Amino acid sequence: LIDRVEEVREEMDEAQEAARFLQQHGSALTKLEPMVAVLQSDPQQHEQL
């Protein structure tokens, strides 16, 4: 009474969604990863800093 076909199907859903999300935002994530640190500094806040 293993009933693991449902668990394997949930793993497929998560993995197919991860693959679909990778196709949807891979270009955005690859362009964001080399300059992520800039997000900690906002133009007006630099004067207050």
């Binding site: 293993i2 693991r4 076909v5 394997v8 199907r9 793993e11 497929m12 998560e14 993995a15 197919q16 991860a18 693959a19 999300f21 990778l22 994530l29 964001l32 990863e33 992520v36 997000l39 900690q40």
Partner: protein
């Protein structure tokens, strides 16, 4: 900044598990064929019991 960090934390995991769709497809195919055989044996057992 925190959301970008969280995305860059999740994205490597998404890339790592995305390749498993095919291994999961063969795993589920064998497992569902196995469950059909389990159901057949349970039916044939219950049928003979009486």
């Amino acid at each position: 900044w925190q959301s970008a960090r969280e995305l860059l934390r999740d994205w490597p995991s998404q890339r790592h598990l995305a390749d498993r769709v095919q291994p999961l497809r063969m795993r589920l195919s064998e497992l569902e064929q196995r469950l059909n055989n389990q159901q057949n044996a349970e039916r044939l057992l219950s049928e003979f019991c009486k």
